[PDB]
PDB file of C-alpha atoms in Angstrom:
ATOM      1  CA  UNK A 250     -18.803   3.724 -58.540  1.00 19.24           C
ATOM      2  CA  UNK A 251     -18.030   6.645 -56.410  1.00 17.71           C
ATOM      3  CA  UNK A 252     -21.328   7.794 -55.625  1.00 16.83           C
ATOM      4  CA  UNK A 253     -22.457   4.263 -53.311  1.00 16.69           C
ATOM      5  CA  UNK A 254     -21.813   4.612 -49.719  1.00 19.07           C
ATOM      6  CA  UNK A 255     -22.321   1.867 -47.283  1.00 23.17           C
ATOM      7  CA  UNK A 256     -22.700   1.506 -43.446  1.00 21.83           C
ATOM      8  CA  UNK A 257     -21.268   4.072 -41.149  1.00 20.06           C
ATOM      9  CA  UNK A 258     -19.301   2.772 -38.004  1.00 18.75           C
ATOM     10  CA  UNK A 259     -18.021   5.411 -35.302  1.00 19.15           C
ATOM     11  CA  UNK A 260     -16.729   5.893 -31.769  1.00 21.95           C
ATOM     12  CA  UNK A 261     -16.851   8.693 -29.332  1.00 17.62           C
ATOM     13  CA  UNK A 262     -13.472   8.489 -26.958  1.00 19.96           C
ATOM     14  CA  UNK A 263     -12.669  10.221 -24.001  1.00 18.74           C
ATOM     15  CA  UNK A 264      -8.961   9.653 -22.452  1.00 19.81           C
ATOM     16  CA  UNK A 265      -5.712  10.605 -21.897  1.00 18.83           C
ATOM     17  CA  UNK A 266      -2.874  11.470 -24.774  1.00 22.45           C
ATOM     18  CA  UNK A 267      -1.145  14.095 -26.235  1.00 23.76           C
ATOM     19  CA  UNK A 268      -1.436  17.298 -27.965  1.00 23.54           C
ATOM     20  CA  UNK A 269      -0.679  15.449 -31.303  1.00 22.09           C
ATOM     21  CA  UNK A 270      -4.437  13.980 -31.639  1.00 24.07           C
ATOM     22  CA  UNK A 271      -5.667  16.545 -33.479  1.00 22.92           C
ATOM     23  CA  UNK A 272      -8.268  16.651 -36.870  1.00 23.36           C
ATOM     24  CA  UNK A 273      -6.855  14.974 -39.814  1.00 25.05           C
ATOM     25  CA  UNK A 274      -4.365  12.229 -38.145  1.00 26.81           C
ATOM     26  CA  UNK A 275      -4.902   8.544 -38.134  1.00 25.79           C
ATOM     27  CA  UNK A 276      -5.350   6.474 -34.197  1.00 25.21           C
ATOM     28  CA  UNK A 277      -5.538   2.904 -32.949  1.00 24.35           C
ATOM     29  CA  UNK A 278      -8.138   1.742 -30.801  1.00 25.21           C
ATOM     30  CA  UNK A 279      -7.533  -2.296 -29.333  1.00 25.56           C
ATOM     31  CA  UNK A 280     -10.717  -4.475 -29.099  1.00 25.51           C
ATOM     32  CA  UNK A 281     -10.961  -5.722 -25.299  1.00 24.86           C
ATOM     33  CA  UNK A 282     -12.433  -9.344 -26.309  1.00 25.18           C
ATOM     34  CA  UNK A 283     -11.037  -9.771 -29.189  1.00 25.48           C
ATOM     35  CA  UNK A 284      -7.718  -8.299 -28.511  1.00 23.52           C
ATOM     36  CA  UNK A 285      -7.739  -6.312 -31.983  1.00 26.73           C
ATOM     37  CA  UNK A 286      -6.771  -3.678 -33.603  1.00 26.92           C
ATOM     38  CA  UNK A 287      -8.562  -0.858 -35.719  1.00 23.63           C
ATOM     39  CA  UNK A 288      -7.531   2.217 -37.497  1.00 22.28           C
ATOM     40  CA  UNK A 289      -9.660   5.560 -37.158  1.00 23.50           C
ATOM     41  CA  UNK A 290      -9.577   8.725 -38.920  1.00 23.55           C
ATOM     42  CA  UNK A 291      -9.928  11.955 -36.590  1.00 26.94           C
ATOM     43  CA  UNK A 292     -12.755  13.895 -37.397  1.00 25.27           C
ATOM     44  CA  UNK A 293     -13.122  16.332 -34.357  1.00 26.04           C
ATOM     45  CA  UNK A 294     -11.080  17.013 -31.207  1.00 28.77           C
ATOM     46  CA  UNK A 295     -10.815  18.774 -27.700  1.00 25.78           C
ATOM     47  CA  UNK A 296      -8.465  19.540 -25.583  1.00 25.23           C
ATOM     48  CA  UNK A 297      -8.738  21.294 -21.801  1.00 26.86           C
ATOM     49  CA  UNK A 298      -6.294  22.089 -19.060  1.00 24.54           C
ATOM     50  CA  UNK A 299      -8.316  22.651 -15.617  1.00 27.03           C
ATOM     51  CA  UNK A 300      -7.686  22.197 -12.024  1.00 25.61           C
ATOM     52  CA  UNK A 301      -4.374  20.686 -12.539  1.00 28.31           C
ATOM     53  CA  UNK A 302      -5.859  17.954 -15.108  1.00 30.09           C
ATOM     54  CA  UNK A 303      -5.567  16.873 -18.895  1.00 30.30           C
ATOM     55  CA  UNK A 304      -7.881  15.081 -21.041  1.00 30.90           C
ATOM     56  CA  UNK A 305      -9.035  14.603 -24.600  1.00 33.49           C
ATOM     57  CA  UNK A 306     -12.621  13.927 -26.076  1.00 33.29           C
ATOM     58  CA  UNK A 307     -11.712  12.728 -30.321  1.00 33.68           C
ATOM     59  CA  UNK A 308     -14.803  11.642 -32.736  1.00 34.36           C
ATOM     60  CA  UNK A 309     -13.602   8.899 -34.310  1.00 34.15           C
ATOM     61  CA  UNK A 310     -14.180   7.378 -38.133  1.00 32.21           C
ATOM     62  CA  UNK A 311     -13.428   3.384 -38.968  1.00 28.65           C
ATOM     63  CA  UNK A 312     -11.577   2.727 -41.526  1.00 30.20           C
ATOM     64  CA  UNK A 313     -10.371  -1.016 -41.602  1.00 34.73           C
ATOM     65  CA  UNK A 314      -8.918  -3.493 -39.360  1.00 36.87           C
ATOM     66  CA  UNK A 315      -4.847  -3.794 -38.844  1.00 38.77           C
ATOM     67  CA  UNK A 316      -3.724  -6.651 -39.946  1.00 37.67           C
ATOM     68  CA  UNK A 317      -2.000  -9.005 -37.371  1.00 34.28           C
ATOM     69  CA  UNK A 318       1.765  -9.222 -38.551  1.00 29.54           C
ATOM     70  CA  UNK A 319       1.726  -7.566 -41.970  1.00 29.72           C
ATOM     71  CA  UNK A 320      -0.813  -7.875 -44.333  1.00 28.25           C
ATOM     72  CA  UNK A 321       1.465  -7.566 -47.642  1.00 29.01           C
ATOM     73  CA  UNK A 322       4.458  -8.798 -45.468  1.00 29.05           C
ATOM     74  CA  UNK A 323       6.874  -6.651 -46.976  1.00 29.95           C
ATOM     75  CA  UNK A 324       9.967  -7.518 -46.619  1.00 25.58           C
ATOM     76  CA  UNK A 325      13.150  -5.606 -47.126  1.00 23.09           C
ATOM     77  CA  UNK A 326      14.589  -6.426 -50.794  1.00 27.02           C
ATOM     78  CA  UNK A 327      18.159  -7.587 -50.147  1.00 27.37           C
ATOM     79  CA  UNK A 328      20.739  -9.422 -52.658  1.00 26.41           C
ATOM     80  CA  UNK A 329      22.208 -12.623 -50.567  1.00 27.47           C
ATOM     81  CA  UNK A 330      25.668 -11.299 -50.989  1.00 29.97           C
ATOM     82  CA  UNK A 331      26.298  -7.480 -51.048  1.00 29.42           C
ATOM     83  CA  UNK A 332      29.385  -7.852 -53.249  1.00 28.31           C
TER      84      UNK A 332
ATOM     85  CA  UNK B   1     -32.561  45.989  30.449  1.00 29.59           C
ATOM     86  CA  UNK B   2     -36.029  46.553  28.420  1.00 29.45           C
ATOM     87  CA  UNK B   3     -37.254  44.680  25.440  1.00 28.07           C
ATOM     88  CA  UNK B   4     -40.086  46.688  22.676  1.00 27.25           C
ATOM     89  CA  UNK B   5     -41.464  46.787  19.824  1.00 25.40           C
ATOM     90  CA  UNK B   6     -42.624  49.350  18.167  1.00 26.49           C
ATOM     91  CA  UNK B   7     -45.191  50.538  15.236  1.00 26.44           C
ATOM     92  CA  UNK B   8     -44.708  54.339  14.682  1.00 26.13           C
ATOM     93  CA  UNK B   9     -46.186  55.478  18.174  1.00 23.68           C
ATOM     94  CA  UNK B  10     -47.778  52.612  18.860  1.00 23.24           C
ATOM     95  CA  UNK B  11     -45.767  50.601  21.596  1.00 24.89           C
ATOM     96  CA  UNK B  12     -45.211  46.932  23.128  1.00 26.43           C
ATOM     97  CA  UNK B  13     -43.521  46.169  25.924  1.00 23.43           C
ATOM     98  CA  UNK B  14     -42.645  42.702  26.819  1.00 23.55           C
ATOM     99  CA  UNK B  15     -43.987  41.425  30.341  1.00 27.37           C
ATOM    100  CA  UNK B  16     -41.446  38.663  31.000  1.00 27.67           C
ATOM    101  CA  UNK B  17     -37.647  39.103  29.443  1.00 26.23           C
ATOM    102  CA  UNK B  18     -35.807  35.725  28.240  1.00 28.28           C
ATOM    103  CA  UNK B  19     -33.404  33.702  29.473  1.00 30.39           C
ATOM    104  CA  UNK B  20     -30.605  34.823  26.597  1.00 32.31           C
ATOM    105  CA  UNK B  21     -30.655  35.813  23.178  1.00 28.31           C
ATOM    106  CA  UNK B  22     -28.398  36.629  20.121  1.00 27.67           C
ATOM    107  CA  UNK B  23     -27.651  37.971  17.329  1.00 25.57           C
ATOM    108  CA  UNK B  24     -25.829  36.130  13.823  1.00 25.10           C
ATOM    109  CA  UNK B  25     -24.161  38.043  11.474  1.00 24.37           C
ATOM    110  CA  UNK B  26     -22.269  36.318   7.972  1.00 23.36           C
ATOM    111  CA  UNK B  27     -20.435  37.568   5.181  1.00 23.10           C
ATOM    112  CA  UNK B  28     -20.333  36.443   1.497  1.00 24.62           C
ATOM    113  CA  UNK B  29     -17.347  35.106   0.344  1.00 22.80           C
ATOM    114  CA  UNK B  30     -16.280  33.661  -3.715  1.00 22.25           C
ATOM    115  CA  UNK B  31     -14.137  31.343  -4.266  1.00 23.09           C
ATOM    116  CA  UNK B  32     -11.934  30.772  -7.623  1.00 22.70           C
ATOM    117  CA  UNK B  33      -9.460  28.356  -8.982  1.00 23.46           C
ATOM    118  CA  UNK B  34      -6.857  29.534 -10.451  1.00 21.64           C
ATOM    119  CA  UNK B  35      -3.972  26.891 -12.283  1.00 22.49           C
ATOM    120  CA  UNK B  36      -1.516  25.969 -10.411  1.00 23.17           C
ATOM    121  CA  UNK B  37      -1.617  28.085  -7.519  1.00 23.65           C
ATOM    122  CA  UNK B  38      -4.867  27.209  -5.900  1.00 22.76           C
ATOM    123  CA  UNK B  39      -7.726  28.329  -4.274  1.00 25.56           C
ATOM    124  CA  UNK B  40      -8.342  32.641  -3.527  1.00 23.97           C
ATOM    125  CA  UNK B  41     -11.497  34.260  -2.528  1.00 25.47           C
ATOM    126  CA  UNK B  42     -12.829  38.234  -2.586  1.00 26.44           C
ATOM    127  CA  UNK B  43     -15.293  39.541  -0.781  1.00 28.88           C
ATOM    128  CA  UNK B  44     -18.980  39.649  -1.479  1.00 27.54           C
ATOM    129  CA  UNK B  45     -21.274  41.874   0.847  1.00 26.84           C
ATOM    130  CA  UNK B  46     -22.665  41.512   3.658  1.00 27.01           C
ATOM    131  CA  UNK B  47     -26.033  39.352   4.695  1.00 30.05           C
ATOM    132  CA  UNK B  48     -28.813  40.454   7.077  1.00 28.26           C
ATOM    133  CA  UNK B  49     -28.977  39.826  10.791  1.00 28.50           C
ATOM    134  CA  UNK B  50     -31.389  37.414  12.472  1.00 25.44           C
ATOM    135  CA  UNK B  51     -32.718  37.233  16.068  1.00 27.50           C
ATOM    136  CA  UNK B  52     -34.770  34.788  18.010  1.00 26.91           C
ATOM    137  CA  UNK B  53     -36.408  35.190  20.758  1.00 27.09           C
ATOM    138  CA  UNK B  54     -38.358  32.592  23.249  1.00 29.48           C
ATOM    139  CA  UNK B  55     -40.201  33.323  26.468  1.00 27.60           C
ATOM    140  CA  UNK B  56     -43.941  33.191  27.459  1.00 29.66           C
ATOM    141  CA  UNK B  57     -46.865  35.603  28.226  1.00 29.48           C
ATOM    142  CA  UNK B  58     -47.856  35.337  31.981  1.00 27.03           C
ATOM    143  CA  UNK B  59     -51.850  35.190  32.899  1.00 26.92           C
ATOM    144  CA  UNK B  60     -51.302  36.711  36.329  1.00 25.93           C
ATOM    145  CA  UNK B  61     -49.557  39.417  37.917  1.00 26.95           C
ATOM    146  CA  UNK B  62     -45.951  37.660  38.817  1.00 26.13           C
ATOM    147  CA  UNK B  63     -43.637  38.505  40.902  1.00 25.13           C
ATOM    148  CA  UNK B  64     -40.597  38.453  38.687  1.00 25.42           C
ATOM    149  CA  UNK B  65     -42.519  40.418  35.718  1.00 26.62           C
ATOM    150  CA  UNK B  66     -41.070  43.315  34.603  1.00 25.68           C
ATOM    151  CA  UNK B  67     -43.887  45.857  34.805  1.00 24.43           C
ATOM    152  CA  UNK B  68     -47.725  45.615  35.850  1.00 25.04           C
ATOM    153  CA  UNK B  69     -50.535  46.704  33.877  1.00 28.03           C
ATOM    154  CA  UNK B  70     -49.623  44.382  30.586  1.00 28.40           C
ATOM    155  CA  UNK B  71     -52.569  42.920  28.671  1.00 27.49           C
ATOM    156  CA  UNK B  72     -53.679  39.461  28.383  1.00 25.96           C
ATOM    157  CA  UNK B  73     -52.116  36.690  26.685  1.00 27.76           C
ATOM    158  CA  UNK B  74     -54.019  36.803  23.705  1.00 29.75           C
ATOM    159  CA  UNK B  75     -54.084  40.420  23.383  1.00 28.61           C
ATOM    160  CA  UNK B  76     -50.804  40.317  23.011  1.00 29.64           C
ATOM    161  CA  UNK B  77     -50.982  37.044  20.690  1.00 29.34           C
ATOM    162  CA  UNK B  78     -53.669  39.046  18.487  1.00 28.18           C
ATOM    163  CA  UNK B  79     -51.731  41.991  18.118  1.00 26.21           C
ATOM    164  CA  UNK B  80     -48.051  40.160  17.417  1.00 29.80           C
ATOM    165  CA  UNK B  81     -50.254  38.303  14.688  1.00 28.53           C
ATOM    166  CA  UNK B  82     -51.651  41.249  13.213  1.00 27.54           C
ATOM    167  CA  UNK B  83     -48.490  42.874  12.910  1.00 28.37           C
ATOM    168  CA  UNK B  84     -46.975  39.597  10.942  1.00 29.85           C
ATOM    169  CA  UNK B  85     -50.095  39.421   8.840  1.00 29.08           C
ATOM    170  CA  UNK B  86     -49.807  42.605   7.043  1.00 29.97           C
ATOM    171  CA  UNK B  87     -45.978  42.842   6.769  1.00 30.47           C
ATOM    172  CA  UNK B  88     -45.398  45.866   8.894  1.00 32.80           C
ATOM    173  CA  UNK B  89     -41.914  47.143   9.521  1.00 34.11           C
ATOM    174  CA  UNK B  90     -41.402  47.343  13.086  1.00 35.00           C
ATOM    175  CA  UNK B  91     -38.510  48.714  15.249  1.00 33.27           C
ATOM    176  CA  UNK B  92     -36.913  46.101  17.779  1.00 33.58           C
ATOM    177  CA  UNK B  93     -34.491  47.463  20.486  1.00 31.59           C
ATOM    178  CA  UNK B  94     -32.755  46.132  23.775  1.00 29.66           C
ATOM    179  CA  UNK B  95     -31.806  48.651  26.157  1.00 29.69           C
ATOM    180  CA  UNK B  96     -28.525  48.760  27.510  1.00 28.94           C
ATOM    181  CA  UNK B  97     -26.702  47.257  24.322  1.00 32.58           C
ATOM    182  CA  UNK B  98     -26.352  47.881  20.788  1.00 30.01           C
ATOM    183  CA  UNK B  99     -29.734  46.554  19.452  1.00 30.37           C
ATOM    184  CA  UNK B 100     -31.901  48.920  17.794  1.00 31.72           C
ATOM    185  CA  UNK B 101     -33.030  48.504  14.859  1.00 31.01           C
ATOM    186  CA  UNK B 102     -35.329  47.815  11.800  1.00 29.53           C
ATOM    187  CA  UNK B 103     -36.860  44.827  11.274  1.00 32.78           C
ATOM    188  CA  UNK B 104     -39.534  42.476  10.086  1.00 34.55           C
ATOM    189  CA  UNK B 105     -41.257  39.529  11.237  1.00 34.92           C
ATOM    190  CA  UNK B 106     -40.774  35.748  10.016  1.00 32.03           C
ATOM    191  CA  UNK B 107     -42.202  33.199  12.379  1.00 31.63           C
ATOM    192  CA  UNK B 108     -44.752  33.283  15.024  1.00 33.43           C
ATOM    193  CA  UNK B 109     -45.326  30.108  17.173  1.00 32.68           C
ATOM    194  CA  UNK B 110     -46.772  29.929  20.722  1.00 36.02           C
ATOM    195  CA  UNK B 111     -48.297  26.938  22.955  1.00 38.53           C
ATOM    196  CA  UNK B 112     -49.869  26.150  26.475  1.00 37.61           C
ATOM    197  CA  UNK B 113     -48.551  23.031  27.946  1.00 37.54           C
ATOM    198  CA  UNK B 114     -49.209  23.074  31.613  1.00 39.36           C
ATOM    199  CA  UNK B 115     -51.993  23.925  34.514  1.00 40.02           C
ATOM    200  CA  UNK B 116     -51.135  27.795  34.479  1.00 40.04           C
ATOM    201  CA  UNK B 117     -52.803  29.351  31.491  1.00 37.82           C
ATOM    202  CA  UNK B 118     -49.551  30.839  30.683  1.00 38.81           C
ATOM    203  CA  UNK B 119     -48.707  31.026  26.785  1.00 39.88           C
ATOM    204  CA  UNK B 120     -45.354  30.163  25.824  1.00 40.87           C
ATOM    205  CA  UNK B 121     -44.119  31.328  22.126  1.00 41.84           C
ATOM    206  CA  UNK B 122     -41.140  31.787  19.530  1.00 40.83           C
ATOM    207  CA  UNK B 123     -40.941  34.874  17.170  1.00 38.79           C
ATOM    208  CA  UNK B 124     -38.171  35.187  14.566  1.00 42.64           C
ATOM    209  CA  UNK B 125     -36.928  38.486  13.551  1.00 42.61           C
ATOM    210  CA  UNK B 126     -34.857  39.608  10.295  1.00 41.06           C
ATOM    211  CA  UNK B 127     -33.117  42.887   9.458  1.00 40.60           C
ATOM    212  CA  UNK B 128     -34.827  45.634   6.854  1.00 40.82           C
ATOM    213  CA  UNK B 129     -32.675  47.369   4.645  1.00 40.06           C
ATOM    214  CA  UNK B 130     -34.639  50.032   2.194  1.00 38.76           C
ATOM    215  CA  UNK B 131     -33.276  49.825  -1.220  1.00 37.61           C
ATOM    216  CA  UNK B 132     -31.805  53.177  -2.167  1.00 40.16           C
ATOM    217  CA  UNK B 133     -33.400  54.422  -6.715  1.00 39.23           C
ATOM    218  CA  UNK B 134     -31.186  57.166  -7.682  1.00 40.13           C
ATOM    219  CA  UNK B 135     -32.679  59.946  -9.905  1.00 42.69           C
ATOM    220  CA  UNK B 136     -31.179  62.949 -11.843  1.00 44.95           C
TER     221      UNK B 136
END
């Protein structure tokens, strides 16, 4: 079972951020129509500093959808009465 | 003043001097960007000088020529041509100034356009500079 693969989805960004977008760290990227959101895996990064400007070009991996809310809705395990 | 050009010891006068002419000069200048300060430039070398001139080759003896005995239009118009055609480098000089020097031809243009037989023209002139192969 660990040697199927299935359909490849990617993105190619270009924008503004931080210097903590670097390879190995997981980003959000909103849908415009649809108004959600997906979580990507870095794969390859670059930063430059010229003329008095900043930007950021990241190669982007899908990994699922965020689910709206919380998908396992955890919720913090309390007692009703503390003592 | 005088206007000539010459080829070695062979010698042109010109019948009729022009109205004005000059001489541009330029310099080569880079530019760099450097963060947060801005723009600075160094120098670059120098360019070559250029010189126009514009006047017209008269078919009779006038009264405002500079000399008598000149050749015909054409004569002069053949030999001008010649000279461009095989690339010869000529010596231009303007008496009474600081013009004299080496140079080579670019353009040649020339016209009739009235009753006189007179031959109007443009020639375009560009600074020669020998490159210099060192040896040991």
């Amino acid at each position: 079972d660990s040697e199927f693969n299935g359909i490849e989805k990617s993105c190619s960004l270009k924008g503004y951020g931080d210097v903590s977008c670097i390879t190995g760290r997981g980003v959000k990227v909103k849908d415009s129509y649809t108004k959600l959101v997906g979580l990507f895996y870095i794969d390859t990064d670059k930063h430059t500093w010229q003329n008095g400007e900043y930007q950021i070009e990241l190669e982007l991996n899908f990994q699922n959808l965020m689910d709206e809310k919380s998908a396992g809705q955890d919720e913090p395990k309390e007692e009703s009465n503390l003592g | 003043m005088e206007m000539w050009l010459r080829q070695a010891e062979d010698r042109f006068r010109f019948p009729v001097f022009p109205s004005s002419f000059s001489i541009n000069g330029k310099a080569a200048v880079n530019s760099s960007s450097i963060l947060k300060i801005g723009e600075i430039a160094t120098f670059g070398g120098v360019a070559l000088k250029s010189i126009s001139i514009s006047s017209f080759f008269p078919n009779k003896d006038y009264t405002f020529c500079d000399y008598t005995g000149f050749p015909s239009p054409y004569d002069c118009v053949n030999k001008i041509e010649k000279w461009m055609k095989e690339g010869f480098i000529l010596r231009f000089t303007i008496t009474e100034t600081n013009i004299n020097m080496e140079v080579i031809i670019e353009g040649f243009s020339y016209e009739e356009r009235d009753g006189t037989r007179d031959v109007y023209f443009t020639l375009d002139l560009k600074e020669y500079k020998r490159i210099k192969i060192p040896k040991v």
